């Protein structure tokens, strides 16, 4: 049907305004499409925050707003507080459908950057033993909670077989992701080179180890 | 105040059906819709439908009007949800929001998760990993169904622990867990991961010996 779409990602200081859109692929949104946008906190956690273009649903901050600027409608932060790092997703009433955005990522820099930490674990002898080799690549400790996970073996991108979970936040609030690559101990041994490449505020961190 | 009360957690064969509820309290049932949201792992969300209680007025997207039944108990303030046809898509967190004019949900369920899944209570084989601070680990392979807990050391280690959610790989699920710990405590202290698996009473320790 129609597509909503949406910033993937956007990053502010605290105090700082920023302004989120969503735009549908018809052309203008207008007061009919009733604009929503929600906030999903983790685990899970669901608050109604704009509803019909422009009113806050019950006891939302007077910092959100909702507005049509343009053609396209548009949440604005004015002073962004830490706590306001969440997915926001808008919906539009469209050919009595609520269509979707994917979500906004917004990053509200209540710490400082952190790199990622990153450990690559080979297959133990046991779990060779059943002719599966796992490898895990875990990746702790980044902020901003976007990281992106490459797998390479004997330097040729891995294509399939490989599974990574979506960032969690640590309870420090920095947060954490982890990256399987699952081959047969029949094809682990035709290699020698495995990495697990790891990209954060585009820099890149590789640990690889060596099948011997 | 408004409390929006959800049925849990749902185990369900391919083919099969089911129903989810969800209660209203803190409001006037009969003058707002209630609408159900779909949450899949990492699909977005898609509204699925709305029902007004007042007259039974029902919306649905196209997509799930054939396998989707709404309706709404006003006596017991309960809305209902009846899936049928099951296939693995279906598994997803469902949502009931809180609906009016202009809008589908000003407040939230907490979201049911349903696992639609032909496999069998499987316990986890537990795997060690050793690199050889240094950090440690344990796989906690092939699984079903949800949940496992890890502990390290009994609870006796619990600072510098990482547990990441399960990936489901084929149809039983993967989890792995980590600690690390100053690079002289180990191997003089023995690091081991416990796995319990409830529904398989399955209850395993793993030490973790250098490479
Ligand atoms: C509550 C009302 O009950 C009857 O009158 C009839 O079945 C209507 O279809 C039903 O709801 C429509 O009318 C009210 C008018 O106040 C709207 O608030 C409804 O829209 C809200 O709920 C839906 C499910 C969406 O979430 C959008 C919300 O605004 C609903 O509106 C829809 O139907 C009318 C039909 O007259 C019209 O076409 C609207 O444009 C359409 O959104």
């Known amino acids: 049907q129609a597509v909503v779409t949406q910033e993937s990602a956007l990053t502010t200081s605290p105090g700082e305004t920023v302004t989120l859109t969503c735009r549908s692929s018809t052309g203008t949104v207008t007061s009919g499409n009733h604009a929503n946008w929600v906030q999903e906190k983790p685990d899970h956690l669901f608050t109604g925050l704009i509803g019909?273009?422009?009113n806050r649903a019950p006891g939302v901050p007077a910092r959100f707003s909702g507005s049509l600027i343009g053609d396209k409608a548009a949440l604005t932060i004015t002073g962004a507080q830490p706590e306001d790092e969440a997915i926001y997703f808008c919906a539009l009433w469209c050919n009595n459908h609520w269509i979707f955005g994917g979500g906004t990522k917004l990053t509200v820099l209540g710490q400082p950057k952190s790199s990622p930490s990153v450990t690559l674990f080979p297959p133990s002898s046991e779990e060779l033993e059943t002719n599966k080799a796992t490898l895990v690549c875990t990746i702790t400790d980044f902020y901003p909670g976007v990281v992106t996970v490459d797998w390479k073996v004997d330097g040729t991108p891995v294509t399939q077989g490989m599974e990574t979970t979506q960032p969690s936040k640590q309870s420090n609030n920095k947060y954490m992701a982890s990256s399987y690559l699952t081959l047969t101990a029949r094809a682990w041994e035709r290699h020698s080179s495995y990495s697990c490449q790891v990209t954060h505020e585009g820099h890149t961190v590789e640990k690889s180890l060596s099948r011997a | 105040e408004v409390q929006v009360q959800q049925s849990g957690t749902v185990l369900a064969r391919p083919g099969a059906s089911v129903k989810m509820s969800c209660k209203a309290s803190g409001y006037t049932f009969t003058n707002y819709w209630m609408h159900w949201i779909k949450q899949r792992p990492g699909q977005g969300l898609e509204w699925i439908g709305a029902i007004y209680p007042g007259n039974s007025a029902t919306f649905y997207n196209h997509k799930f009007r054939a396998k989707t039944k709404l309706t709404a108990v006003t006596s017991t303030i309960t809305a209902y949800m009846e899936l049928s046809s099951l296939t693995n898509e279906d598994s997803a967190v469902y949502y009931c929001?809180?609906?009016?004019?202009?809008?589908?949900?000003?407040?939230w369920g907490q979201g049911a998760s349903l696992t639609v899944s032909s496999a069998k209570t499987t316990p986890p084989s537990v795997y060690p990993l050793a690199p050889g601070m240094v950090t440690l680990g344990c796989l906690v392979k092939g699984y079903f169904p949800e949940p496992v807990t890890v502990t390290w050391n009994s609870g006796s280690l619990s600072s510098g622990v990482h547990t990441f959610p399960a990936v489901l790989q084929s149809d039983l699920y993967t989890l792995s867990s980590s600690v690390t710990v100053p690079s002289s405590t180990w191997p003089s202290e023995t690091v081991t991961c416990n796995v319990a698996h409830p529904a398989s009473s399955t209850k395993v320790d793993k030490k973790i010996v250098p490479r």
């Open positions: 929001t809180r609906g009016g004019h202009g809008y589908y949900g000003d407040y």
């Open positions: 019909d273009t422009n």
